[PDB]
């Protein structure tokens, strides 16, 4: 539902009409295809909530 934005050191999702950054996760994003097709894609980490829970 958001936009990807950066402050120059980090990347966040935020909503369009009011700045409120949140960490990028598997749950505020959706997947489609591999990196090769998209014009202007960038590398960053995406957080996964499941594994660090099931680790403990």
């Amino acid at each position: 539902e958001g936009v990807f934005v950066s402050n120059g050191t980090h990347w966040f999702v935020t909503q369009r009409n009011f700045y409120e950054p949140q960490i990028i996760t598997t749950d505020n994003t959706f997947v489609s295809g591999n990196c090769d097709v998209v014009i202007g894609i960038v590398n960053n980490t995406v957080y996964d909530p499941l594994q660090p829970e099931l680790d403990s």
Binding site: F30, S32, G33, V37, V38, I39
Partner: peptide, 10 residues
């Protein structure tokens, strides 16, 4: 239409 349909067909 899901936004990936544009970036995949731009």
């Amino acid at each position: 239409v899901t936004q990936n349909v544009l970036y995949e067909n731009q």
